[PDB]
Design a binder for this molecule. Structure first.
Ligand SMILES: [Cl-]
Ligand SMILES: [Cl-]
Ligand SMILES: [Cl-]
Ligand SMILES: [Cl-]
Ligand SMILES: [Cl-]
Ligand SMILES: [Cl-]
Ligand SMILES: [Mg+2]
Ligand SMILES: [Mg+2]
Ligand SMILES: [Mn+2]
Ligand SMILES: [Mn+2]
Ligand SMILES: [Mn+2]
Ligand SMILES: [Mn+2]
Ligand SMILES: [Mn+2]
Ligand SMILES: [Mn+2]
Lengths: 202, 201, 202, 202, 201, 202
């Protein structure tokens, strides 16, 4: 009865309608689908590859429960397309996993698939699910502060422009600055005020 | 044993009272009804269109079974007014399907109807069934930021005007902008300040 | 555990002290007591008229746990004084539902009682509790935004004046505007700023 | 194991040190003590008044549990000065009760004692424990809004001054305005802005 | 079976090592120690003062029994260094009692000692044990409001200066003002605005 | 139910897969694993050396329930993989306590292990988690206030410069100031305003 937003499960071509992809789209939910996993080293006796399958990365809008997600997929594709739906405890790791390009896949030397074969439904983008921890945010925010003093950046445009240029040096991007300074605009306003009247003293 | 909030079914003019619209209101649930579907291409040979039908989007007050809604409207409109009572997994998708403007219907290249011929029963509003996730909100917020920098938008009126013109290009509307910037006005005030004094330089 | 402000439960005359109506008042909470329910057309059909009971509409000062309400009144009016407490999704309904004048009690046609026999403890006043849902609040807020743009309203006085005149056209009132813009003053300030400098451009 | 801030209990002169009052003071906690209840109509056979007693209104700093409050008083005054400590479910009603001047006391016609005999420890003031409900606050806030428009009050001093004069007409005081506009200063700033530029248009 | 956080006991110079202060630090708990009490009036006839003693305010890391602390400091300072080990119900009261400046000690008109002769072990700070309740905070906030109106205080520096002078009259200090106005700066900004434009009229 | 970010629990080699160190990494959470605890001088004195075990210092991204951590790792490393999970009051301690170099393990003299054998998963870095308590934060904030008054510091740049010079005298650093004034920018703005207009008065 746990409730989460990130889920994963398998679909096999053998028990899904041909237009399954367009159907999954009608759910309005964002999804990542693996290249076809058709070259997975099996370890059954005398079997080279596993039964071919897709991995689906599925992110619900609000915390729901695995079972709810399962009945939804069953109703959509047929009661015979789904048995189990794990909750994903690490979206990044599991996104990489789709192409077996994650740390645990790399170490197990699993077959690597093609990024270009991944299917993105409903504007899914992994970039939106990897988000800073609290300490990274603190860390980056302090970097932002030293940038603003170091360069007497008078306002957010000036900061933005500076990031456009020198961003990589400091590990920063436009979107990352936005995530970093969220909830801290009061503090930002102190900084730009400071920068503003400093520049006026020169 | 399966309960749900959102449902859908077909209604046939040929076998419903002529004041059905009104009757469905006695029900006390929101509903969207398609324009009359009288131009759905027929596969049956020698016949251009299917028998005219309405599609009904039905929104129960609390999770109920499909059968309950079957009876509710047989008892309302008569035993032979009801085909294809299904549960609905994405209200917005189905609502757009009433005029064949969902991705899937466009996909199957079905015939487009007039969104104006839709009927809303019991103050049904589609916008009340659709909402952004956190990620979409962050996404759209970043778009709004780039718009503001790209065009040196000095204040929310200028942003609004810009949306009025170019909104569709960027996936934005007035009400969506309002939903996107809620809770972030401090940040907005940082952007307009910057735009303002940039324009002055 | 669910918390809330609006509650309801039943009281059985045969096991509440005879001065109960004054013990309850002792809580400082506003409540609404129903006329005495002596004509509940037997739900089992055991003996025509269902037992002598009351309906209480109870309004916690702060948000609290149902269970806490029981206790509070079990420790107040005796051990088997009250039955099962509900939270209340819709104040207005569970209210009219007190004389069986809710749209469900007439739809289910139930003995219609009298408003007179209603008891209003601690200034309880049904109107005070009629509130906007989240969606209505969003809806009205967007209306307010379009008004402000449409008429270049420069500040809250100008908005207020406009509502005084054309308020009904748009479903608005002074007090409703106040309820709608609560918690959104920052956004309001964005709008008036915009209106202000727009009017200055011509 | 409930946790609350408001408690009450009895002390009888016969089992408390003479300087009990100064001792209760050493607890740092605010307290209201009843005039001596020595004329309480008993209903034991052949007994005119009850054993004389004090009522103590006791408000802890943070939610604690009855038992904790009891052991504290026991350790302070002796294990023989306290048996039970009810949690107070209505401070106002119970404050009045000290002099039997509450609605439930008045109706039971209990002996009325002298306000002047009440003992206030550690700056106890009932005024600080009676606070507005949510709807009263809303109500008063809307009144404040109409005052500000009606009189084009340009800032909080002007509002304050107006309250000094006409406050009673509208049910307002300085401290009450403060309680009403708490958490709403953003809204206040909209109003005064409005008032300010309105006065400039005349 | 009774556990507590705050304790107190007597220590006697005559029967403690001469580096006791240091030893009590090996304990790893905050502590306040009174100045030497060597002027406590004696009721015993022919003797002016009681045998010099220190009062120790002891603050356990977690709720412990009185006996535990008895042993802890017998084992530390020797079996005969320990009288009057009590639990403490109001840390601030006891801390003020170390110099006989609590209400009760003033009440019993006891002898006042020098607050400067107090010793703090393990960075013990009394201000960390004292805090305002919600009601006191509201009270003091209203006082701060009246001060601001009464004196047309235009900004927080002016308020601060005023507190420096007249603070005690109103029960206020710099750090207390800071505790009182936390979370209410928006309101403060309303007051200074008003003061500002009042002074201009 | 208690929520938190810092946690710790033990792992028994004999019932965790042999690639556990890489299953854990799979969680994206930073943790710190102790050198292998093979020398816990038998607490019962049953058989000199206590069973072979590990100590894990685990750092949830968001605040969560202990129980959820178990599950997470029971579903991760097997059913009897881990023992009893503690929340952690002091990060720094339960850390050093990993090689028994906490001030309590030496005070209780316990087998001192080696830092080398420590395992730092997902960039876990003890320093990043050393935080200010509420009291220290209040304390430092008041210091910052007196600095601002004492030197009429007009804005955050001036404060920052002052800290660059005299910071150590007062126990302050750029990053510490940032941590101290977080959530208090409104108050900061009061102070700089005051400093600003003071400097203008002479
Ligand atoms: Cl933000
Ligand atoms: Cl907002
Ligand atoms: Cl508000
Ligand atoms: Cl406030
Ligand atoms: Cl603050
Ligand atoms: Cl901040
Ligand atoms: Mg919506
Ligand atoms: Mg304190
Ligand atoms: Mn696979
Ligand atoms: Mn159709
Ligand atoms: Mn009834
Ligand atoms: Mn009495
Ligand atoms: Mn003494
Ligand atoms: Mn160990």
């Amino acid at each position: 009865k746990e409730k989460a937003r990130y889920f994963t499960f398998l679909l096999y071509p053998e028990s899904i309608p041909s237009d399954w992809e367009l159907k999954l789209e009608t759910l309005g939910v964002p999804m990542a689908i693996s290249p076809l996993h058709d070259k997975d080293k099996s370890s059954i006796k005398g079997q080279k590859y596993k039964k071919a399958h897709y991995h689906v990365l599925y992110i619900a809008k609000n915390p729901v429960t695995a079972d709810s997600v399962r009945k939804k997929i069953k109703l959509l594709l047929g009661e015979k397309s789904l048995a189990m739906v794990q909750v994903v405890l690490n979206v990044e790791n599991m996104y990489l996993y789709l192409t077996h390009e994650s740390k645990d896949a790399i170490a197990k030397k699993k077959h690597v698939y093609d990024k270009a074969d991944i299917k993105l439904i409903n504007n899914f983008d992994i970039d939106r699910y990897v988000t800073l921890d609290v300490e990274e945010k603190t860390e980056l925010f302090n970097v932002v502060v030293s940038l603003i003093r170091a360069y007497t950046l008078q306002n957010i445009f000036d900061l933005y422009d500076f990031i456009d240029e020198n961003g990589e040096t400091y590990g920063l991007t436009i979107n990352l600055v936005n995530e970093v300074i969220a909830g801290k605009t009061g503090f930002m306003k102190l900084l730009f005020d400071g920068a503003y009247q400093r520049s006026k003293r020169g």
